[PDB]
Design a protein around this ligand. Structure first.
Ligand SMILES: Nc1ncnc2c1ncn2[C@@H]1O[C@H](COP(=O)(O)OP(=O)(O)NP(=O)(O)O)[C@@H](O)[C@H]1O
Ligand SMILES: Nc1ncnc2c1ncn2[C@@H]1O[C@H](COP(=O)(O)OP(=O)(O)NP(=O)(O)O)[C@@H](O)[C@H]1O
Ligand SMILES: [Cl-]
Lengths: 295, 295
């Protein structure tokens, strides 16, 4: 496979994302305006990884770094190989918080591949290929499709599993606030038909509430297939979630938590802001973001 | 409650509907341009019921008739009562075929009440109340909401159960063909979490496919929670369903069957039309309908 020239550079901006959004377990995701920025240069030989910000000192500084793995996977998919790499990460996406830092790193590395391929005069990978490859790193497509495509996404799989997604236009009156604090619960293998039908009606309603009917966000963010089962092992997230919802705020777990996402139609009460902080949660307002950007 | 004057008349036209539409079990429905016509007059006393067409000779002609039940429930909800009634039905919605004749009957009777209330100068029942009351007759809101609201609907329940729905704007390139023939199974009590996540991703996708991306109808109409389990008890429906999908036609069970619905953007293959007929099914082309009409 054609070895890339040395001396190419590209910079990538990848957003955080929040999966599930209540009942949309393993399918729904939404891209948020909190970014990691990755700058990469091709060189004659070797690999240097530098990391500043979130996860600094917690991520590997070698070829096992998720971004580097994704760079190499994307290049291979594009029929190329890097002669050598310098990789600099400026991270603002918190790790292990439910905001999709692993998915963003894979999407970023694949974005870097598209940047390097283009500047070498080669074909880039289509968004569908980006979604496929990023989801393979995660094992499920919801965060990955969100970081690739932006907006809100409906993702799905076909079973070598195929991963795909489509982008929704989030209603402009919906504003997202993330409550971010400072092992995974085993989910039931089987669920009642009644509970499955419940989530079916709610996730179907959720795509409508995200796009056309923001007044239905409370009803559409109800869930019976993962949030109640996770509550006892993460009481403070469950407590903040319960409090926001009791105040009419459409609150959901950000993925598996512990962060909590509020899909708001009016600004949060000062009381709710104070309640979250008392539990240890910082409230960060975020806009729905576009997908990964490459230049 | 105010007794209505004798001598009022109203005519109601109610569409059939198709529930589930694949993975949207107990939530999704779509209104079809196949109508029952109900003419009602208030009289000094008594109850006279005449029925023509579908269901003629099999439905009760007394106060237990579903339309009459719905008229009186609606009038009572409207704070009124009929001194006497003449009810004549011209039915084209086949019964016991998966095309929502029971829900259509309740919606028609409730529409009749709104017609009589209006001509008596009283407030009519809101669409939300119509959906609530019709769904109470059915035990589920998907057929009822479709017949009330028209178009495609996402319906849901909250727990006296609350039944509600919201109307989707079906993509104009989507045209419906019903395979209508001339059997009972108890669905499984539990389903795997895996199968629930599957239907979750597909029903979320279906709302997008019905409204913006009809090219996704095949993927979005896949189901694991009721259609495969109903195949054995309705072999000919399952065969027509399986064959249409094998030919690239987004086919689903109409409700619980035995009718089969094709969600098409182009007319059916010359061959598939013949395969359905060979299996005993008449293929009827239908447009998405508006809701119940009252005059
Ligand atoms: N930006 C990153 N760069 C490199 N490796 C990363 C990065 N983010 C995550 N990882 C790897 O994944 C680990 C954290 O994984 P994880 O707990 O899934 O966090 P997350 O994906 O950001 N949040 P969550 O939604 O809770 O899964 C790190 O210790 C790394 O091994
Ligand atoms: N238009 C109608 N007028 C009066 N009674 C009706 C009408 N439609 C259905 N019924 C009653 O409902 C019975 C048949 O119910 P059924 O056929 O199971 O309902 P359905 O709504 O057509 N079911 P499905 O379309 O298969 O989901 C009849 O024997 C009547 O008692
Ligand atoms: Cl906790």
């Amino acid at each position: 496979s054609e070895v890339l020239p040395a001396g190419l550079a590209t910079t990538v901006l990848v957003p955080a994302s929040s999966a599930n959004l209540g009942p949309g377990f393993d399918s729904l995701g939404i891209a948020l305006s909190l970014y990691d920025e990755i700058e990469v240069n091709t060189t004659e030989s070797g690999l240097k990884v530098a990391v500043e910000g979130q996860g600094a000192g917690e991520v590997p500084l070698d070829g096992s770094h998720l971004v580097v793995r994704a760079i190499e996977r994307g290049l291979a998919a594009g029929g190329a190989a890097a002669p050598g790499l310098i990789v600099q990460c400026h991270n603002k996406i918190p790790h292990s918080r439910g905001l999709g830092s692993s998915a963003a790193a894979a999407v970023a590395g694949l974005g870097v591949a598209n940047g390097l391929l283009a500047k070498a005069g080669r074909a880039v990978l289509s968004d569908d290929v980006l979604v496929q490859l990023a989801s393979e790193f995660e094992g499920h497509p919801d965060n990955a499709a969100a970081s690739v495509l932006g907006g809100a996404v409906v993702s799905w799989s076909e079973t070598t599993p195929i991963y795909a997604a489509t982008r929704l236009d989030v209603h402009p009156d919906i504003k997202i606030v993330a409550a971010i604090p400072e092992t995974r619960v085993l989910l039931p293998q089987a669920v009642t038909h009644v509970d499955a039908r419940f989530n079916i009606s709610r996730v179907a309603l959720l795509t409508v509430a995200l796009t056309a009917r923001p007044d239905l966000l409370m009803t559409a963010t109800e869930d019976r297939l993962h949030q109640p089962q996770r509550a006892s092992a993460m009481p403070a997230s469950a407590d903040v979630l319960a409090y926001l919802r009791s105040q009419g705020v459409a609150a959901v777990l950000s993925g598996a938590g512990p962060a909590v996402l509020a899909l708001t139609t009016v600004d949060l009460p000062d009381s709710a802001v104070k309640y979250a902080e008392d539990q240890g949660f910082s409230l960060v307002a975020m806009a729905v973001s576009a997908g990964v950007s490459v230049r």
